[PDB]
Design a protein around this nucleic acid. Structure first.
Ligand SMILES: [Zn+2]
Ligand SMILES: [Zn+2]
Lengths: 135, 33, 197, 90, 97, 97, 221
RNA sequence: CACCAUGUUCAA
RNA sequence: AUCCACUGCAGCGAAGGCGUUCUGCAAGUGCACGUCCGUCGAUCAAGAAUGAGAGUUCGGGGAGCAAAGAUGAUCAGACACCGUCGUAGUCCGGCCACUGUAAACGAUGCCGGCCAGGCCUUGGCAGAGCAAGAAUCCUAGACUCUGUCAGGGCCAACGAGAAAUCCACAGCCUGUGGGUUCAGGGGGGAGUACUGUCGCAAGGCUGAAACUUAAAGGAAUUGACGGAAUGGCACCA
């Protein structure tokens, strides 16, 4: 099933792409965000714990979410990319460009593109003491 | 590195050992008096 | 009582008279003060006005729990409640009680603006047994208090034994009959409180 | 001459009840016994009659506040918050 | 709001005539001696109103000091208090000007 | 053996400088001692710019949004992630990129 | 499997914006006692001005519209907030300048309470040789008082519809950067964010025919 | 950025 | 709880330290000046007031982080680094709570005089300019130039230094003396013991000796090494 509109129109959902260093969410929802349509993570497409953030897992996840959002009736995506943000890291993880390419090549039209990494006007004490994650 | 050759262990840690010694001594003399 | 009281004299509603009511005193209230009671009263210390004319930061005492009730909340020394929020949909109001709880009471309940007087009295350590003697001698027959481990098993579920001890868990149930409901009544937890409560 | 070093009004308790408790009761009893400032007449005359009751021997005023001191700190901040709330919802 | 009242008061007490006190002020108001009546902010409301009424009868000016009786005395150079102050002879003070 | 005339930091006329947190390590480093780089990237690199612009509606080359990061590093992580490299005693006095 | 129990609703924007038929939103259908109208009542959508007005010159502005009433498959969205884009204002902020920020809570005479946060940056004169173009603190206090009274004179004594229309036609920013040259020249003066804090009673017919004019587009179904 | 501890005495 | 970006060879404060906006309160420096006083000043044992963080005390608060603890890995071990929790603590208030230490550093006492050049920057004052929104008017706290006073730095002679380096000083020093305070006398033992004094305590300040030893130490050089970087290379890789 799907929505009904005139011939020359595009149904726009919003695709939140959560690209942290440990996983990768691809999350297609209604423009409100209130109604999830389909979300797939990089950990649903691989066996190893490592590959949850691999560029291949994010590709397969954004694929398998694009096919289902087409099944539902969504044709274009306003894209909202996100890193862990807050205090962790404002740099988007590896499986972000691969999710973008997956959606674009798969066939979803791409509207706006955005960065919604949570950032602080000022922040709570970051994890790891004064000396940080000594390695 | 940041420092030149402590001729023993870390001065902070031997300072700390001295403090522990000193209050053990203090307790032994508080036993008597 | 720990808080001072106030004889406050109003006029009679329908008689030529003067009704002298008695209410727990507000901190700062003095003799000859002209407190004001009603819906159109102003937000001044000591005034009694409905819980709806109060902005959402007001510090109140002598708070009612029901409409037409008369001051059943926040009445001990240094007690005060804080008006958190109002709801006009229901005509009700969330208030933060001295216990730290948040109670919802109708916005027609009347409070008194300010603190309850006589505050700071638990910040003095009673130094003698005689101080607490005189304390409770005017309240009720409850002091001193023999502890149950020091009794005999005929007098308390804790008594007896060759060493003074409780042989069973102190945390007793809530459905415990009256007579074995001694110890920690329906305790959700025990031990030292650390972190959050 | 000076009659005590640390003990103050707590000389009445002598040796009993513990130093750290006599400390607190000294801080409390100095204020309970002292004459406080009357913001009405401008004289340091408020004597504590009972717990929470303070009578001014000059002005004659009778005020309710404070077990051991005329004004608690929460009272002085409550006055300010109530004043500003009234100021804004004039 | 300017605060040179506390400065002109030094001039009044240096040279000029003042009446410190409720009764002195009322006597100056009953006669035609007073030119200004300063009133401490903490004064009793009833005495405040009484002095303001006497001043509106005498066509005299009243100034609310924004200080206590303690501060009014201190501004006068005094180690006592004063709720009222009557200024009979300004001298060189330049208050009402 | 003072290695730097400014002792690893740009603090001058200050007593205390706010301590910031390294981007990855999470180490508290003074705001002036930290090796800080405000970097601007794109949401998309040219390895994907054509493939996305061909499927976009409101974007194209020279039009995609950017990332503005401001990565702050401690000296350890800077040297490790080769944001900075050890320089000669004479090339340490070079302060312009 | 979950799409079987869902309908689509058209999201219709107010009179200010050119494009109205947008955002076919989803919801679970009705099972009798519980309907989906009160599930859509409050469904805030963030929508770019570049799509609400179809011009790319305004594509750096997200507008958050709140659903307030539904008619058939047409849910009526009113103004709830607006903001720049992170890309936009992070490109705006550069280093050696000085940013002046201002925040006001004002009333639009409709009862709407608005928070307005405006951002501006000091400007380099063309002949300038120094690198600073820093403003002084007294200069920034004066600029902020100017900002405050400009934003007031703009939004208050003007209904929320005209306020939104100005936010589109960003006259507040230009008025501020024009008046700034007397204290310190400002650049890129834009309203960073606008929020609706407290809104009055609903008045559904008012919502229907004053913030819209009717003309509800053809709700395809 | 898995983990990688040690090297008898004088003599050179 | 904290005030990102702006945020810096920037400012302020005696130092510790200080960063959202409006606002109350008192204050400081600098600058301008035919204002006043008229030596009232410099440095300071004793004394006094501030003094990061940790720590203690009494009452609250507890998001996040986190000693101890728990706990999963790693390991030969690993109550270590790494991971998940987690208590005190970090936050607020207090007779004006106590403590009174830091790589509290510029490892550089304070007051005064003189000290080549070039560059950047902060705040005034002075004199100029082609030098600024809406407009086109009009002025404008913006910008440019010059001078000067005060401040913050950078690089470049003489000099100094054991050198590193210093440079409005670490110069003016065997061609040694402007004034003043504090501290040091090879390395350890030892900032220990005893005693005194302050503190609730932790502890601060004060502070040896017996004995032991020929070097410790500082700067710089050449090589070697590096689980440091860069760049070449080898089928003994
Ligand atoms: Zn009195
Ligand atoms: Zn790091």
């Amino acid at each position: 099933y799907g929505p009904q509109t005139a011939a020359g129109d595009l149904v726009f959902g919003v695709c939140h792409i959560y690209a942290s260093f440990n996983d990768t969410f691809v999350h297609v929802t209604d423009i409100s965000g209130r109604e999830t349509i389909s979300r797939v993570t990089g950990g649903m497409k691989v066996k190893a714990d490592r590959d949850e953030s691999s560029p291949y897992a994010a590709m397969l996840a954004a694929q398998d979410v694009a096919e289902r959002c087409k099944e539902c009736g969504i044709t274009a995506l306003h894209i909202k990319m996100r890193a862990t943000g807050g205090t962790r890291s404002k740099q988007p993880g590896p499986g972000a460009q691969s999710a973008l390419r997956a959606l674009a090549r798969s066939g979803m039209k791409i509207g706006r593109i955005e960065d919604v990494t949570p950032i602080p006007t000022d922040s709570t004490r970051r994890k790891g003491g004064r000396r940080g994650r000594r390695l | 590195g940041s420092i030149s050759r402590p001729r023993g262990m870390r001065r902070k840690w031997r300072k700390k050992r001295m403090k522990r010694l000193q209050r053990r001594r203090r307790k032994m003399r508080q036993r008597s008096k | 009582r720990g808080a001072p009281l106030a004889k406050v004299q109003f006029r009679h509603p329908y008689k030529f008279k003067k009704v002298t009511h008695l209410m727990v005193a507000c901190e700062g209230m003095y003799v000859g003060q002209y407190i004001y009671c009603g819906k159109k009263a102003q937000l001044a210390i000591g005034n009694v006005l409905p819980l709806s004319k109060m902005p959402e930061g007001t510090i109140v005492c002598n708070l009612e729990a029901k409409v037409a009730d008369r001051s059943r909340l926040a009445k001990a020394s240094g007690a005060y409640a804080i008006v958190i929020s109002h709801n006009p949909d229901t005509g009700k109001s969330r208030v933060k009680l001295p216990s730290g709880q948040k109670k919802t009471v109708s916005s027609q309940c009347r409070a008194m603006i300010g603190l309850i007087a006589g505050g700071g009295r638990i910040e003095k350590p009673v130094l003698k047994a005689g101080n607490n003697y005189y304390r409770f001698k005017v309240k009720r027959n409850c002091w001193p208090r023999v502890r149950g481990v020091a009794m005999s098993p005929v007098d308390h579920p804790h008594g007896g034994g060759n060493h003074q001890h409780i042989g069973f868990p102190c945390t007793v149930s809530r459905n415990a009959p009256p007579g074995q409901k001694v110890g920690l009544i329906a305790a959700r937890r025990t031990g030292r409180l650390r972190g959050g409560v | 001459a000076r009659r005590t070093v640390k003990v103050g009004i707590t000389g009445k308790y002598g040796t009993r009840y513990g130093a750290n408790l006599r400390k607190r009761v000294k801080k409390i009893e100095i204020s309970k016994k002292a004459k406080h400032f009357c913001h009405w007449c401008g004289k340091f005359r408020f004597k504590r009659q009972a717990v929470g009751i303070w009578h001014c021997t000059s002005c004659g005023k009778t005020m309710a506040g404070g077990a051991w001191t005329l004004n608690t700190g929460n009272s002085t901040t409550v006055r300010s918050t109530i004043r500003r709330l009234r100021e804004m919802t004039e | 709001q300017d605060q040179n009242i506390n400065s002109r008061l030094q001039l009044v007490v240096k040279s000029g005539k003042y009446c410190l006190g409720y009764q002195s002020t009322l006597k100056s108001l009953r006669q035609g001696k007073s030119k200004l009546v300063i009133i401490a902010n903490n004064c009793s409301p009833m005495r405040k109103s009484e002095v303001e009424y006497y001043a509106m009868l005498s066509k005299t000016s009243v100034h609310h000091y924004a200080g206590n009786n303690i501060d009014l005395g201190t501004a006068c150079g005094k180690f006592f208090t004063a709720s009222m102050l009557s200024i009979i002879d300004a001298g060189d003070s330049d208050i009402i000007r | 053996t003072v290695k730097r005339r400014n002792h690893g930091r740009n603090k001058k006329n200050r007593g205390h400088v706010c301590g910031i947190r390294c981007s990855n390590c999470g180490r508290m480093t003074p705001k002036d001692k930290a090796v800080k780089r405000f970097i601007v990237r794109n949401m998309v690199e040219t390895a994907a710019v054509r493939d996305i612009a061909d499927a976009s509606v409101y974007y194209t080359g020279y039009n995609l949004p950017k990332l503005y990061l401001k990565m702050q590093y401690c000296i350890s992580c800077a040297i490790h992630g080769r944001i900075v490299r050890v320089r000669s005693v004479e090339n340490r006095k070079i302060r312009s990129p | 499997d979950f799409m079987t129990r869902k309908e689509w609703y058209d999201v219709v924007a107010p009179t200010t914006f050119t494009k109205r038929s947008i955002c076919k939103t989803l919801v679970n259908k009705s099972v009798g006692n519980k309907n989906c109208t009160d599930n859509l009542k409050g469904r805030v959508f963030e929508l770019n001005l570049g799509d609400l007005n179809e011009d790319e010159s305004q594509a750096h502005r997200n507008i958050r519209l709140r659903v307030d009433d539904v008619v058939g498959r047409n849910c009526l969205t009113n103004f709830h907030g607006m903001s720049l884009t992170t890309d936009k204002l992070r490109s705006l902020v550069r280093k050696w300048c000085t940013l002046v920020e201002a925040s006001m809570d004002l009333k639009t005479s409709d009862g709407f309470l608005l928070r307005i946060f405006v951002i501006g940056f000091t400007k380099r004169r063309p002949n300038q040789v120094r690198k600073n173009c820093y403003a002084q603190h007294s200069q920034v206090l004066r600029l902020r008082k100017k900002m405050f009274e400009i934003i007031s004179a703009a939004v208050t004594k003007s209904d929320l519809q005209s306020c939104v229309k100005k936010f589109q036609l960003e006259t507040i920013g230009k008025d501020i950067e024009t008046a700034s040259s007397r204290y310190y020249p400002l650049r890129d003066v834009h309203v960073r964010k606008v929020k609706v804090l407290h809104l009055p009673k609903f008045e559904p017919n008012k919502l229907l025919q004053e913030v819209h004019g009717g003309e509800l587009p053809k709700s395809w179904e």
